[model samples]
Target chain A: PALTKSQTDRLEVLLNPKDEISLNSGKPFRELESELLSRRKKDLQQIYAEERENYLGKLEREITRFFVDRGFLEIKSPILIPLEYIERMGIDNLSKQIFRVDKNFCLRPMLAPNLANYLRKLDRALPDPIKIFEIGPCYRKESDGKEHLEEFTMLNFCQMGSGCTRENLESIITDFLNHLGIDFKIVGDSCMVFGDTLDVMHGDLELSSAVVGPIPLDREWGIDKPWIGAGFGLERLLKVKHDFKNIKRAARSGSYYNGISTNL
Target chain B: PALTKSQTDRLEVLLNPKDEISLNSGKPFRELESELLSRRKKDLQQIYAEERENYLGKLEREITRFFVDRGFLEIKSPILIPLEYIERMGIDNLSKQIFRVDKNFCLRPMLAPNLANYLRKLDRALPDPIKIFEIGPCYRKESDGKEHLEEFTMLNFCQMGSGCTRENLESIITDFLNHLGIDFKIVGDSCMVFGDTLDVMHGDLELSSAVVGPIPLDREWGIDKPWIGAGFGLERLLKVKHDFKNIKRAARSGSYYNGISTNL
Candidate 1:
């Protein structure tokens, strides 16, 4: 009675809740929802084999605590990508964000174009301001829905040769947001970068009249010349830490963040 | 002339403040690194294409105002589903959760087995608490991750024949989660039963756990057997009203919430 959820797979790939409970918690909704999703579909398939080891141990301990609290040194590039070195460094090309593995083995969406191909493969033992951080898994060829998840998990972390600055990477991002307590309020790119992941699902699903603040998205890493990047929309900093009215229930379900209309 | 903030895609997508600034005010990372994300990349791609044409005009006015606030008459099913009316109507060997789409095509992951084949073609002009709600897109093959997204989005409300109570569907899911201002605390299927999405994620992970509350793992956790309905991890309630951390920050990342095999 009072059920409208769905996380079903039965026998395995379970969690298909498809709702249906509320006999005042007696749990008699449909033979305990098919004997609880299919009774251990192989322990739900070894929980899909520990998804990339808890996504590389919580993204390599928060990117090695944002590059070893500042000394920095994390590099492991080589996600096997090459389509003419991103059409000869005119990156961000999208006909199919290239993933052939046969049209000539691809797959490498960006660890700064394989950390600029690991700086021409350590053209010199690679250590300067080098501060690196990379946790991987990036593939594309997705077209629409499930919000472009062909494969995900990205974590990149940067800093390079000769004591990296921009105020030492903004003081190592303000000491990793004072160690993840997070209380941000910065946005001076004359601000208008709205739709942080489409404004946290069209501003918590009142369905955006296009106003979720800081709406400016201009990212280009060459299609021949223009190379720019100003992206900081971590779903508008997790929508200021929570009042989710609805970007389809904050994200993965607000219509799977839409077809993203031909790469807007 | 400074850039290698590790070449950039917002530090290849983990985007952890690559030189954060907010001395606490807002919008000024060199005016979005120099005027609105590098001086308007085609006008922030034309304001995200008028914010996705106003996000599909507010999801087509919230699916025609949820079927005109329930005077619902929308019925247009049958998108090539048959093949001997699914195992001559047992639903392809009792829905191993049919997702074949080839050995004579199959898909119907549940519209209640196509509303029991539309109550056997509206047998006797049916009408009884029939308040149905559907907003499709549900396919399945498996091996995707984080709460296993193989293509998801479902509203699927139903009131079936006869008084359909649980206080009239828990007062229509608490007035539609209070028209999406969402404030849930209705836990009861004995506080959301746990087990079954393949025995949490493949059983004996300590006899299964999580239907939301303890289930950030789409499957395994405290396994053994039996897991059923009343699921609620709607992306961890959209990462708790959207603080979207890890899985590259939201909409299912941290290797897509399909769990098990973690000390968590």
Candidate 2:
């Protein structure tokens, strides 16, 4: 006989227990349930002992250190930004995805526009090359899925003015992934805003999307300098690194703590 | 003669330059303007060289470490939460302040409700005296003032079960503040939600508000256990630490890097 819905849910929680367990035995339902409960009790104790610092937070600090050591100033851009900046990025189709705060302001869906604005303002004042990056939360109206997240952490890094060629872009990305000890391959891809791009991939997972700029959009921001930019989803990085079945496991979640299920 | 509006704005930028400068001169207007402009150029370079890591980010990491060292698990709570959670916190008059995502969801204004929910779920599973803390962005439709922010970073830490008395709450806050090397005095205060609270003050600037719970609202979340909770406005801490006149200077801003202005 099949297990009841409540029993199936309980089994699901135990199946993804903090510790490994075997449930292939053809034991009685009562006996199996007792065994699963005992295993879960032990699992919770191990989880508390093992998992203390969040993997996502650790990865963010690591990435920040990497860029800072490489001479990139970390820019903490505002999550709430003017909507006009979104249009400046040539992103009109993502109206639904953009979380509007008021009639004029909206929660920033991407960090490019802010970076573009920064480049325009700091281009003349700063030195030859202006290297900067921002790592923070971004929002979008994403569907609930194993891969997608409505709110996710984004790491966007860019260098404008000198040594920002396509070759240099690829070189930077290679060195970056290497620093993280992540084995990734660069493949050609396209974006709605950046047009042709280089996608850093680890197997089926797209780690980051990168591009070398002097694109048509650059003229709009008064940016006529050579630049290289890349945006990485930090959650996706953690997901790939830890082999999480669900993206939510690596996100700012209440149900899971550092990819461990709290359901039990 | 009084300075023109444009000249006044220029002076405003220079007055808060990255480096110290004296404007008590009897020089001609053009000469003063030229001198100020030259000083501003020098200041920008100095800011780039000196201000590499954001102070806010540094403080966040330091506080996280302090909690983790004391056996408290850091919880990364969701930024967007159901609107009902707000009402459950006994906050009803701030409809205008709350940034609603849709009819059901809104950007989380506080980290308590999520913490409260976690206590309910993990209360049975985890060991006695469950300790958890979250340090992230929280939102509200606050006025743009030196003391208020529309979007800000919040550090909320709580301990539930044994040893969660009013005395322990004060002791924890005292140790936490002392660990940061911040000189603070705790004063009795009342809140709309938590009723009486202990406000951690650094000379009129309220750094944090803390309370001991087993409150009436605990019944709503099925939480009957004694819990001690405190919420800290991180920007305010940075403000007092660095003596920033504007809270925006210590926030995730496009116009500021750390506490230095980028409006050059």
Candidate 3:
């Protein structure tokens, strides 16, 4: 006989381990269940032994240092933005994907608009080549997948003015991934919003999308300077770095902590 | 005879500065509004010059260092948790105040429940005096006020086992605030859930609530340890530090960036 319904449910709670005792071996279901339960408890104890600081938090700090050491001024932008800014990015057509706070404001789907606003102000006041970066939470209403999360951390970095080009964008992306010790490849790709862009990939996973701007959208923002920007999903970085079975394992979640299942 | 509706609205957007010119001074609304507009722009420019890293992020790092230096293991707990955990905390009556993600999960209203679970696990494996802390976003559904926000960051720290006494709790609070260089006072206070608590006050504002427990609730979780725990509002700390006119100015906000209004 196959495992009972309750036994299957219990297995799911134990994160559904691959190794199993065969029903064909004629072992009792109670014995198999007891073994699985003890295994899960052992696994959790092992997690506690290796787990120290939060993996995501440690990675965030390391990434911040990487940028700050390279002279990029880190920014803490608002997670909420005026709805009009979303329209300006040509994402108003995708309203269903945006989390609306009210008629006027919505959770920011990305960091580009706010960074663009800053670029305009900084261009007027600060010196040339304003290098800035922000890593914070971004919201999108999307189905959960192996590589996606409804709420996720994003690291967006942009350099405005001289030497901001496609090649420079690629160079910066290389330097960043290298800093994270992530092996990734860049390829030319097209996107709905930014038109042609460079996609940072590791195996089949898309790590980030890099764009060089003086694009038409820049005109709308009154941003006339050449600029290079890339937005990386920080969770994706941790997912790839740690080989997390699910993207949620790399995110801030109740089900998982430090890529270890918390079910038990 | 009075400021027009448009001028009044403009004043509100400019954060309603004091020391205003009178309409009786024979100035056109246009001229007075232009002065206010210029002042707001100048104010934003000043903000950029003084702003370096995100103040919240900076404080988070500093606070992490403060704890880690004192042998506290910083844990990045989930922002989402099972609804049952809320019920366990005796907060089910406050359903309207919680932001539910779905039927089973909700954005965590606080960090205590998850930390408590960790305490149980760590208690079994680790040595005496298990110290862990978490700093992350907590959600609540409430009318915005000068001292609160719908979304805010929280710093919750707990120590379980030996030396987890009221006096020891007070000593930890003192060291934390002293490190932040804040002038604070502690007072005896009571709450519905934690029963009696020590309130960390900066003048009239409550920064945190500290409790020592083996309380009635601990028995429900199978915890029978003497424990000291404190939960702090990081934004409240920043608000008092900077003398922000509104608590939102110290939070991750769209209306204000680094305490400067972003209406312009």
Candidate 4:
């Protein structure tokens, strides 16, 4: 049990006394209940924090299960994509934020473009409704800040054929949210290269962006289908779900092990 | 079911009745059982391919479950690392093979140095027997070949503090291989950046490399611990286990999802 400041002060006076120490004074004795209450609150807070640390793991596992149970194939694409692919996505290869292996190769800034080349070819041969997703690292050069990371985990999932639609995208995300018991809103205010795309919001933060295409970008990859997809930053998902002010504490270097912040 | 070339030739002659028009000649019809046997073999082959796809999935799930059950913490580290860190590990940054984001940053070729920084720092604050692992994409520059890849998936894990040892490294890998029903030998060979490393071989291929430290390389990450870790090429594992001739068909740019070759 922790002794409160006032209780400790009163106990100090009782122990010393001015002349002789008095054992009869009830003032210090009365503080025992308050001291015990304070200790219990601290103990409960610790328990809550320990419980919250599992949120990231739980969400990641369940979300993966969501896709797997529904027959979506998980694919792993290369992180170092050709520079031409970056330009095909309408991203500036000459930008200072781009990472280059040489003049012709660069670290993948997004998964969609590289994945498209394979997905489009697969669509020609595979069964209808080709559903695939990749959860991996994406790199960029951004100013170091609380929210922006130079390298972060990204989850990009897409479904082609007749199954691809805005409603399916919404339902997929909503089902995941229901499983997590987290509330979210589908908004169309996020500014992207693809215009005001549909953003999945949990308060002010955009955790994911949904895009339905046969758009211009699809043409570059030789994809000529009406398909829908979304990309979610894993760190951003953790941050928004856990209400973290800094992504570093949620995803990057911090006093955390398996998303449990050790600073506590 | 598909007919073999010899069966097809025999069936063609019987169907066409060419030149002799010999319907009574039981040469082709007498071999009806051979025709059925060839068809059954192809039918079984198709079934085997579908059955083999499940092996990749099963291995992935079991390996993840193995680490989680063992209380090893899974971490997500940045793919873009400081160039100094790469050089400190004795990798040649000046080579054309290295991917650089700028004058200071490069896409990490390996996960060890970045993870060592965290494990060493966490070792001081966290409890003893600090075990951590990361499964992610690693990039390199290699000539286009059946055995080499420019980008590949890597599983790196280490046990620090009092739990670190060479025997533990061997036991950990052995346990994982046992779970997947894979046969492997821990050979004292294979050239690596850390001199001659402990290699895990399946047949003629080296699937993993083990390193025990307080080796001089640990000093680069400010780590001075008697820790041990091993890194496995996930593609190589699938190739060796599944007996794949080309790593591409086993790892990357495959026509099918989940590393299942579509040509089947």
- Candidate with top lDDT is 2
Predicted candidate 1 versus true structure: per-residue lDDT over B189-253, tens digit per residue: 22222222221211111111222222322222222222122212233333333333332222311
Q: What's the TM-score of each model vs. the native?
A: 0.24, 0.92, 0.79, 0.75
Residue B248 error for model 4, in Å? 1.3
**Whole-model Cα lDDT per candidate?**
0.35, 0.81, 0.78, 0.65
Which docking class does model 1 fall in? incorrect
Candidate 4 lDDT over residue span A42-98, tens digit each: 432443334322334445555666776776666656677678876677765335667
Higher-DockQ candidate among 2 and 3? 2
Residues B137-199 of candidate 4: C-alpha lDDT, one tens digit per residue: 677778898777777767888888785778788889899888778899988974446766788
Question: Rank by lDDT, descending?
Answer: 2, 3, 4, 1
Residue lDDT tens for model 2, B121-166: 7776789989888898889887677889988999999999999998
CA RMSD (A), model 2: 2.5
Pairwise TM-score winner, candidates 3 and 4: 3
Give candidate 2's TM-score: 0.92
Interface root-mean-square deviation of model 2 in angstroms is 2.1
Worst 10 residues of 4 chain A by lDDT: A13-22
Instruction: Give candidate 1 misplaced runs (Cα > 4 Å).
Output: A1-59, A66-68, A71-110, A114-132, A138-157, A160-264, B1-183, B186-224, B228-264
Docking class of 2: medium
Model 2 chain A — which ten-residue stretch has the worst lDDT?
A15-24
